[PDB]
Symmetry: C5
Subunit: 108 residues, 5 copies
């Protein structure tokens, strides 16, 4: 198993690491039919989504998607700084594949 | 996929964006049979609901409804400011379709 | 759909609105067989419960009950002030049907 | 339905109320096979568990067990004071059956 | 039932207790197909994971895994200090089997 979000992104096609290093500016959540998704944007202008569950996803991904949306909401509400985002750039807005957060009052 | 709550609202009939720009005044939650819903109101007088799961909803719009209700509760409790609300105006009170929040911290 | 907890309570028999206007004094949760419930009390002496899921509950209520119990726990932990409680008075202690929370902010 | 954790504990065999009146000292959670449980201890030395789901538990107890573990974790994290604990003393460590939490009150006893 | 994380770790093969005594430095969560996992690292350089649900895992382990990932996220967000970690060292990075947290105030 990968030990980094970067290492993890390297295993997929059409993924790309975006160094956010900032907290979420806006959180949008929809329960509208066929558009059950979450959209987050940063002051950098960057906009991402946790795309509507469908055929692009496998079964094990069902819970992961819900968890990802749970994470984005709590991250937004607690004003937690997001470090990097591994996203699929072949989707508009870019679909989130993985998220990493780092509390840096130290190093590594 | 839409990149905005406004853009998302544009894809539906009977929807309408309400610029709330305020925190939830009251949170009401019911578990009473046939009225399992959540009602939120703002000091503006505006009142909205996350309607009882019915036949008007598609299969896995089921999880989204629960999540919407989870979001409204945590938003209320944390006194988080809600920006906009895409709602279906063909329901009384207006049913929530999407919610957007932005912290200009 | 009702726009108020009071309006909602009016639709049911054996319900009654109780103006709590106070935070939860005690939170009791049981996972003991046949008594999987939650009991909350206020300094007013008032005691309420989210009764054990049974034959009087339709399947739409199943998630609502769990949500109600989730709400009471987080309300208690965050010391959030509860406004009103629509409860079924034909149960001892009174069973919670709906809860409303307001804020003078 | 009982109106108290004490009244509730009275309905069961092998149960016993412990007046903790303190916050959780340690929270231990395991996902190891056959030992999916939670263990909490207090500075009093008292140690309790939310035992691994099995035969002794029924089917509505399934969600209640998960909820109990959810409650212990949030209680621990928020440093919330636990009042009493109705536990089954026929298990080691004692298995948690119910938990009660009181929130101050200058009105007094 | 064991009464300690260390006593619990002793019941398994390929497990090992790591005394972390520190808060999580980084939290990584993936929903990418076949890599639905969580990775946490500490300033000590130590890196652990809650491995992708597979075959080693029985069935009641399904909820435990989700719970473990829920715990790591909330622990990270609240900057809570983790005491010990019982992990399976036969995986890279080491897979988390159990976690213990203490206060000592």
């Amino acid at each position: 198993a990968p030990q980094s979000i970067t290492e993890l992104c390297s295993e997929y096609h059409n993924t790309q690491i975006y160094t956010i290093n900032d907290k979420i500016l806006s959180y949008t959540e929809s329960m509208a039919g066929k558009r059950e998704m979450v959209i987050i944007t940063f002051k950098s202008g960057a906009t991402f989504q946790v795309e509507v569950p469908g055929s692009q996803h496998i079964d094990s991904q069902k819970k992961a998607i819900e968890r990802m949306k749970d994470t984005l909401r709590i991250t937004y509400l607690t004003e937690t700084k997001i470090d990097k985002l591994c996203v699929w750039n072949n989707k508009t807005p870019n679909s989130i594949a993985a998220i990493s957060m780092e509390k840096l009052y130290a190093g590594a």
